[PDB]
Design a protein around this ligand. Structure first.
Ligand SMILES: Cn1c(=O)n(C2CCN(CCCn3nc(-c4ccc(Cl)c(CNC(=O)c5ccccc5)c4)ccc3=O)CC2)c2cc(Cl)ccc21
Length: 220
């Protein structure tokens, strides 16, 4: 029996909202956000991890294009292959494509594996968010209603299931019966509800939220 509502922020597993600026690095912020929660679950410490590390180092071999887009799954594979990712403090975000500056001396997390969830299955996504932690997802954010969102449960009839923006599902619930996914964005804390958007849940894979979910794990 899953909880009716989940909010990983209340459990100390979510870092402060980040601001990607003019660099299309949402995939990198989605990936580090998911791994940040697993690091807290494993070690008890909450540490912001380096999105810039992914932008600069998880590149053409991983199909990623830095400030021009990428995949959360191949970001996880880079962290696995590299045997680490630096802290955000040591490798801070510059919103630019740079040469790789990874230094194992400042490693703050590792990744053992990642799991992809089946396309469009919001029931499986709910289970993963409840039982595993925050889940990286793509959404279709190419709608003014999306970036103009201020509060409430977001529903856009013109939304598609084809994703183009990486975000992090940190919980779920309902607002007076309107079910939602609790989504951490990387557009700063003045977007939406202090940086978050509550997106329609169980409305036919609204905006592609459950099209391509994935989450990392840190295993002993
Ligand atoms: C080593 N390696 C891989 O493992 N892949 C993977 C990448 C993930 N796909 C899974 C496809 C699932 N899928 N995901 C998205 C998707 C999910 C999240 C996000 Cl936010 C985005 C947005 N990202 C982009 O639109 C993007 C832009 C520029 C460069 C890369 C991605 C897309 C869209 C369609 C689709 O079938 C399998 C091959 C590789 C792909 C390439 Cl092109 C080159 C090397 C790769």
């Amino acid at each position: 029996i899953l909880p009716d509502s989940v909010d990983w922020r209340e459990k100390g597993c979510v870092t402060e909202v980040k601001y990607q600026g003019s660099c299309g690095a949402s995939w990198a912020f989605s990936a580090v956000g998911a791994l940040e929660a697993q690091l807290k679950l494993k070690t008890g410490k909450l540490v912001s991890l380096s999105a810039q590390n992914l932008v600069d180092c998880s590149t053409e071999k991983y199909g990623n294009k830095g400030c021009n887009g990428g995949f959360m799954t191949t970001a996880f594979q880079y962290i696995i292959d590299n045997k680490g990712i630096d802290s955000d403090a040591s490798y801070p975000y510059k919103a630019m494509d740079q040469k790789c500056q990874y230094d194992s001396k400042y490693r703050a997390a590792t990744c053992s594996k990642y799991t992809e969830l089946p396309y469009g299955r919001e029931d499986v996504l709910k289970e993963a968010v409840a039982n595993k932690g925050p889940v990286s997802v793509g959404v279709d954010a190419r709608h003014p209603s999306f970036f103009l969102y201020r509060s409430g449960v977001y529903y856009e009839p013109s939304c598609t299931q084809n994703v183009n923006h990486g975000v992090l599902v940190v919980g779920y619930g309902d607002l007076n019966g309107k079910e939602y996914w609790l989504v951490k964005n990387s557009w700063g804390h003045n977007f939406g509800e202090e940086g978050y958007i509550r997106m329609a849940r169980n409305k036919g894979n609204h905006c592609g939220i459950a099209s391509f979910p994935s989450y990392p794990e840190i295993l002993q």
